[PDB]
Amino acid sequence: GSHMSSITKRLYHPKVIEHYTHPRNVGSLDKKLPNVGTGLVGAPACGDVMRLQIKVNDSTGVIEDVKFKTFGCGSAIASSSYMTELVQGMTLDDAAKIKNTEIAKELSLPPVKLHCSMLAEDAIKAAIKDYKSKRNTPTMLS
Amino acid sequence: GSHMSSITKRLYHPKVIEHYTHPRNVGSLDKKLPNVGTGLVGAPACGDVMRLQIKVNDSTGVIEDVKFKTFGCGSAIASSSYMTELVQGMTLDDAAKIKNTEIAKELSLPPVKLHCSMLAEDAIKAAIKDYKSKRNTPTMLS
Amino acid sequence: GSHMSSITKRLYHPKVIEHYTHPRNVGSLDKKLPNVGTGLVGAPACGDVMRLQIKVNDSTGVIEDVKFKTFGCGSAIASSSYMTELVQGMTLDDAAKIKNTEIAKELSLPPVKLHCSMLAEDAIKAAIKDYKSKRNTPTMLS
Amino acid sequence: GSHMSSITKRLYHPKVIEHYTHPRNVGSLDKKLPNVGTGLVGAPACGDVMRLQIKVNDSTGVIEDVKFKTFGCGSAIASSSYMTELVQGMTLDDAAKIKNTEIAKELSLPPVKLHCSMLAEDAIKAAIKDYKSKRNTPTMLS
Amino acid sequence: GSHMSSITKRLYHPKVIEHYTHPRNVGSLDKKLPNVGTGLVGAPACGDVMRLQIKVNDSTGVIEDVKFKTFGCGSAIASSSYMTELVQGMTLDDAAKIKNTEIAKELSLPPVKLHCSMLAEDAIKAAIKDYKSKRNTPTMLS
Amino acid sequence: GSHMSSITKRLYHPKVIEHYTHPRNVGSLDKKLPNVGTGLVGAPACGDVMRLQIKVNDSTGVIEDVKFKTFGCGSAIASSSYMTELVQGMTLDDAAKIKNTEIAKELSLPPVKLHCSMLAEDAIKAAIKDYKSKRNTPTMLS
Amino acid sequence: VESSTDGQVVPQEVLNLPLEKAHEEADDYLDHLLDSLEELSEAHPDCIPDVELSHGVMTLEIPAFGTYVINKQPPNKQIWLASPLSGPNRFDLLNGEWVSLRNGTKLTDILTEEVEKAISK
Amino acid sequence: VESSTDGQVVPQEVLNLPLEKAHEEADDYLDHLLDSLEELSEAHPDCIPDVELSHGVMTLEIPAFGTYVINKQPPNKQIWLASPLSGPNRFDLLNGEWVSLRNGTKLTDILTEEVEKAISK
Amino acid sequence: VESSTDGQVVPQEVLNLPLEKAHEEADDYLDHLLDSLEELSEAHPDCIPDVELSHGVMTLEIPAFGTYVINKQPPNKQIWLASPLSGPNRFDLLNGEWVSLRNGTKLTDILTEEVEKAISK
Amino acid sequence: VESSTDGQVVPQEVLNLPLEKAHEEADDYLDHLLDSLEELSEAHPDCIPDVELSHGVMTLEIPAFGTYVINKQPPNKQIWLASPLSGPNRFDLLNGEWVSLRNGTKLTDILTEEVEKAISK
Amino acid sequence: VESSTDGQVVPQEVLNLPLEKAHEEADDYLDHLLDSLEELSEAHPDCIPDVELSHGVMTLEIPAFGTYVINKQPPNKQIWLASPLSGPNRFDLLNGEWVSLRNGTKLTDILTEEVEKAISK
Amino acid sequence: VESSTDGQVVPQEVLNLPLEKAHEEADDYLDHLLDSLEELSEAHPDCIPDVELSHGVMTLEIPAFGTYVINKQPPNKQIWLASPLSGPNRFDLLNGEWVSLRNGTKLTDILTEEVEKAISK
């Protein structure tokens, strides 16, 4: 992998969340009133948060859409993008078991270390687990 | 090998298909409108179509009833008949377990391969998969 | 083993099981009045009857509560008590695999080929199978 | 397995017992009056009883005669008939080690999972064990 | 692995066939009166029809000349070219059993267990079979 | 094991902390004027902060006679009393690779590691290492 | 009497109450398989004129339509069935019964079906 | 009834109709001896402080019940039970359950006496 | 569409174009042999009473006309048709099928003929 | 976040979700199992005397009830079991934990219950 | 035309055909994994510069980014994938193709991701 | 609270402060070594071109400058390295991690430093 540029580009300058909000910072802001459901896995001493929202066609078991939030490093945004693209239009299995190692290799080279800003893997797992529970199969989840 | 008998005898004239429809020919005919909503298979250029309609007790998965449609051959009606007889009163796994050779074993003379003359395996597989989706147990399908 | 104590002790006083009937005798007593579904078992030959009503968090798969009724031998009162404690707040798998041999272990040692003075195991199997029916999973169930 | 015929045949119509009993029905009837104290077996749930009565030459250990009573199934007559034919004019050893398999071969052919249909095995066993006790050999029996 | 480039480029305008025929499209095009014979295979599913025309000195087993018409697929054209150069002035052997992997190899990395994209091998086998027949000898063919 | 008694009772009213300080609570108090040096460990599990100190002659030994100050469970007072007994009259060796077994058996019951009653074992490791650092041999510390 | 539970019981009421299918071990399966064969044998006109049981191998042959031989392979996907038509497939224990980890099939039941398909015609 | 021969053998009841004890065939026997041992020493936890089952032997740690050694005996009088005041005895089948080869009487009864005299006093 | 060429191929005109009889894996011949046996089995009065394969040794019965054993022969002279009063006719691969190099025979085809010769007369 | 990497590392604040069972290798399971056994054994009621681990051999001297050693069965049909009244059971992996395929259920839970049940009374 | 099923005899459409993929046998599985890995990789020589299968031990030279071996485990949960984070894992059927039971998903998909993420970036 | 020890019992706000490593069995040391080797293996675009991992045999292709072998060697002085450009060296534990008993010290630092140096130049 190579620079998108990962961070400090373009006319935001880091990430696209910063561009989106409005209000900035402002430290008076809240996310209200409903939440977007699925899995939340935001770490507040690592300064990074990811929240992936799946939509799933029940009948085929195919992920219709999956969107992400990335807070933290801007490197992580590209990896999140690529997995969410890949997973869409594909099997139930594709959306599960998502790594982790893959994110590290894809961005440039793999340090064989989990950054802690590469939360996308845990986020997707939470979402599919929640989904499986609510449709009444938590006994083959584990 | 023994007679069904259904060697297009008689006054139907070809098969039980002619007898059922009504109006004949007419070349404007259509089949409409409600149906159970189960598996479909058909192979044009083999001149056959099969539609197995299961009804299922949803509590543990018992085939309460299963009726069939056979289009193609009069000889084929007996193979479909015999399987549907067996399958009723029994668990979903029993419904399945259908070969390949089995269809043409009931017919008599099994090559050990299919031609497209017997569609029955594909009809039952289609129906049970469709059932699993609706029953919301996608783990056993994927 | 050791005493339960349920020898018609302590300050029961002819039995706690006796207190739970209500109405005594009366020769016209019947099962009444609400029900949860779940497991109910009883053999008049063994003289025992037990009814376990499980409550299960549908999404988690974890047993929120399980309460019991014990009719029969004094030894059974202790069996029902300790088993429900362990199972509550604990995995589905923990809820399962309760047998006569575990109950004998909790009490003393079993007679010739099990005591058959507890129908605890049968009730648990019925309750689990009912949970499986509720959530609609059939292959793992069979 | 083939028809004797004696299943609901002939002129009786069920069993030779009806064709000579007297008192009919009468529902107040019992077995009367002399008995030889030999084997008795009966499962009153299905209303089928069987009584094989051996007579034994003490000196040579040979079964002089053996006659039967069959109550219930008309099929059951054939089991009783054929076994008693063989065992007559032959040693006590023939009448021992009676299976199960013997029943399957004779006509009945069950899984071997009992239904209540045949009690012939239990009947002969009772009779020969009773004989041994009277004979005054308890070591062989135990 | 590098581009030719012959995938809808350039001045053809879309694909190879467009250039050959001429008049385009025209939706009434037919090849008549003579034909160039020998091997033909073609998929409307993959959109590519290959037709290899060999000339072979039957006596010494040398490829005198070999021309090819490839309809569709940019990648194949270069591979087809490279092989026709090679075979001429040399034996039957080199032309015989050509792959599949080889056509792929030229473009870049082969799947190494291909799909029906390369029908070229089947055409080649037919061509060898055709050579055997015009010489007359089907012993080695079987 | 058994009650000393010392279960944060009585007339103190809870253990060492209440009796010793004075000022109570006051929640404005800190360790002042000096500190007792050496190892330090804080924990949220018992909600209090252990701070040990050691004054021991050193020739071939290190300082390791840990007073094992506990502000946690009342049961923990016994653990300090026995630790100071055991460590004295024994070499540095015994006090290193801290049990685990010893804190556990003393506090309630032996099972594996000390549960979370105190993080004192980590503090004792800090202390032994601290002296080695101070005597200027980091090469036998590693 | 209180012998021999599980199995024989003395209330005689476990025949309508839920209890796990098996509890020991490969033995249960073997009994059910053998029992099915013995039952099947009666009512064969010429479809099956022979069943052969071999020490450690088991053949259930239909020569009037043909059928594959059934074997047990060394431990690793035990009771591996080679049927020519579907190629080889594997059967594993799931919960007191052998249900295939494929789409769910029981081997005892496949033999049941194929035999009575033969009895029919 | 549709259960379960030889596992369940009743036409409805067999608590008053005579039937063979039944065994199959080296598993069942081990289960039976362990079952009897447990029945006999029940209502005490101090009688036998520990029992361990390891392949080809069975220990029951007992500090007051004499010495009973359960062990396999090579083919010929298989499984030998040791009586601490008359030595080891070796047992062979003769009534479908192991029969002593010194008095012609079953092992079940041997266990009855020696175990129950000890729990008593 | 997707996979396995050679193995499965769809240009939707390969059913009228020649393609080699086998290319992979060599177990193809076994499958084909099995197809011949299964097909023949129907419409036998008693020309096959069993097909018993003893550990990959394959017999194809014709017992009212003498049976034969068809089996692999160790390397060199490997794979052959053995039939009485014709001795070895030994087969080797020649182009994607086992064709004898002495007359152009095929052994699969020899069984087809010889079995239907029995059904006939 | 680093050391010794890569599935292991977390900042311990991403653990508001269930963490992976983990492998690396099959031995991992054996290690975890051994630890569980040690924990259960300790806090003795004088029914469990010891837990042992020799040199590749794991013996579990279980309380005076439910005797059986636990060793990992030679290739396929993993882990030994041998209950005194319910007879053998065997386990294969189903979610990174060994699960009986006679009755289902995790192996971890079975051990938990059966030891503490003895400790009570 | 009746052989060999289902691509070498077609009804002239790919729709509604049977296929029991990832069976028949170890060869089929190895081929399938290679077909996924290679197909995705192509048009990049730096994505996978090499694949070699010399024994069922598969080496994948990639100097560019992470890579791992795919070895075939000896009988008892055959096949293995080790991914540096996940560690080594052994796959057993759960849908008729090799499935990590710990992960709860097919092996084909793991390869799918790792190749396709690389060609991108 | 409890399990699976030692760092998973503490709150891990004492993770920074010293705690016993407490490896069990010690097979774990080898897994740690393997994770470290994987970390050496990639994080560069042209170094360590292939890692070969195989059943009991590990070959590690190391770029032009030299090569080293990382394998265990027969009991005592385990995890010996044969360098042909810095000679052979021996390693054995001295404090919970492998330490050279010669010129060097910890194995983990010797590997880290040399691999990173290669990536640079």
UniProtKB/Swiss-Prot annotation, chains A, B, C, D, E, F:
Effect of mutating P111A: Slow growth; no interaction with SSQ1
Major location category of this protein: mitochondrion
Cellular compartments per GO CC: cytoplasm; iron-sulfur cluster assembly complex; mitochondrial matrix; mitochondrion
Cofactor note: Binds 1 [2Fe-2S] cluster per subunit. Zn(2+) binding stabilizes the monomeric form.
Effect seen on changing C116A: Fails to complement an isu1 deletion mutation
Region (SSQ1 binding region): 109-113
Molecular function terms from GO: 2 iron, 2 sulfur cluster binding; ATPase activator activity; ferrous iron binding; iron ion binding; zinc ion binding
Function description: Scaffold protein for the de novo synthesis of iron-sulfur (Fe-S) clusters within mitochondria, which is required for maturation of both mitochondrial and cytoplasmic [2Fe-2S] and [4Fe-4S] proteins. First, a [2Fe-2S] cluster is transiently assembled on the scaffold proteins ISU1 and ISU2. In a second step, the cluster is released from ISU1/ISU2, transferred to glutaredoxin GRX5, followed by the formation of mitochondrial [2Fe-2S] proteins, the synthesis of [4Fe-4S] clusters and their target-specific insertion into the recipient apoproteins.
Name of protein: Iron sulfur cluster assembly protein 1, mitochondrial
Organism: Saccharomyces cerevisiae (strain ATCC 204508 / S288c) (Baker's yeast)
Record lineage: Eukaryota, Fungi, Dikarya, Ascomycota, Saccharomycotina
Gene: ISU1
Shown residues within the full chain: 28 to 165 of 165
Swiss-Prot record, chains G, H, I, J, K, L:
Record note on what altering R90A does: Impairs cell growth and lowers aconitase activity
Effect upon mutating E52A: Impairs resistance to iron-catalyzed oxidative stress, no effect on Fe(2+) delivery and cell growth
Annotated effect of mutating I79A: Impairs cell growth and lowers aconitase activity
Effect of E42A: Impairs resistance to iron-catalyzed oxidative stress, no effect on Fe(2+) delivery and cell growth
Effect recorded for D46A: Impairs resistance to iron-catalyzed oxidative stress, no effect on Fe(2+) delivery and cell growth
Protein name per UniProt: Frataxin homolog, mitochondrial
Organism: Saccharomyces cerevisiae (strain ATCC 204508 / S288c)
Encoding gene (name): YFH1
